């Protein structure tokens, strides 16, 4: 009975960042640049947090 | 990725002065932009700061009260004022781009511009006097002889000097600018060439000095 006494948040705050970023110009050509050699990668985002990458399936 | 910068000059100590700083090839509205300074010769200087939204302004304590940074997102341009000049502001500045998007902290320079030149002294502006150093008539037959160009009496630095638009390179000494008694730059530049060669093939050296639009080009004959 006691739902209403918790605080509201956003559950996606974290990945809507993640987007949010990656929507700069370039950014883009990063990950494609790091996803080159291999399928998965760890990329320095330019807001600083490294983040893995991974690229499931290849259709070009 | 590009960061044009534009305002640099020669302004009396005392006055104002302000450069402004274009961005192109990223999303300029995102970054925090530095400017930082470089005296001739010497180390980097932290200027000041901005941030993304235009909102936080740090400057350095040597230069606070007197620059002012802002920031103009719509057109992707950055202006640096500064006034009450002290000579001690005599540097090349630089605009950069922060590492780090979207932050009110700021971490570091990773695009840095082309610069511009901001001289304080209180002299002014004057283009150079291109006068030949002629080749001897007493040259061996052989025989290895020399020529050149003196540029004289010009303000601020630099000059650049060539040799036939850039056809002659080799064996061209352009020695570093020395500064006379009159407060007033001067350098040579010399080449040495076969002396059969004098009399055959037109030497003309080619002066620019930026600062006060001067092109000269100076025919050097025995």
């Known amino acids: 009975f006691l739902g209403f006494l918790l605080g509201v948040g956003s559950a996606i705050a974290s990945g809507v960042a993640v987007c949010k970023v990656l929507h700069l110009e370039g950014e883009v050509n990063k990950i494609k640049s790091a996803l080159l050699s291999t399928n998965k990668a760890v990329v320095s985002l330019s807001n600083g947090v490294s983040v893995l990458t991974f690229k499931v399936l290849d259709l070009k | 990725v590009q960061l044009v910068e534009s305002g640099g000059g020669v302004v009396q100590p005392g006055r104002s002065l302000r450069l402004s700083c274009a961005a192109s090839?990223?999303?300029?509205?995102?970054?925090?932009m530095h400017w930082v300074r470089q005296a001739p010769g010497k180390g980097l200087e932290w200027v000041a700061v901005?941030?993304?939204?235009?909102?936080?302004?740090y400057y350095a304590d040597s230069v606070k009260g007197r620059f002012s940074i802002s920031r103009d997102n719509s057109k992707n341009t950055v202006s640096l004022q500064m006034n009450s000049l002290r000579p001690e502001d005599t540097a090349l500045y630089y605009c950069?781009?922060?590492?780090?998007?979207?932050?009110?902290?700021?971490?570091?320079?990773?695009?840095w511009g082309q610069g511009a030149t901001v001289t304080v002294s209180s002299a002014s502006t004057k283009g150079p006097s291109v006068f030949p150093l002629a080749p001897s008539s007493k040259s061996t037959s052989g025989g290895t002889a020399a020529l050149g160009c003196l540029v004289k009496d010009y303000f601020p630095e630099p000059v650049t000097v060539s040799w036939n638009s850039g056809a002659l390179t080799s064996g061209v000494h352009t020695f570093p600018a020395v500064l006379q008694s009159s407060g007033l730059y001067s350098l040579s530049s010399v080449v040495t060439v076969p002396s059969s060669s004098l009399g055959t093939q037109t030497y003309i050296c080619n002066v620019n000095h930026k600062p006060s639009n001067t092109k000269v080009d100076k025919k050097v004959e025995p």
């Open positions: 950069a781009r922060d590492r780090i998007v979207d932050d009110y902290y700021y971490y570091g320079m990773d695009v």
């Open positions: 090839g990223f999303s300029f509205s995102h970054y925090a």
């Open positions: 901005i941030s993304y939204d235009g909102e936080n302004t």
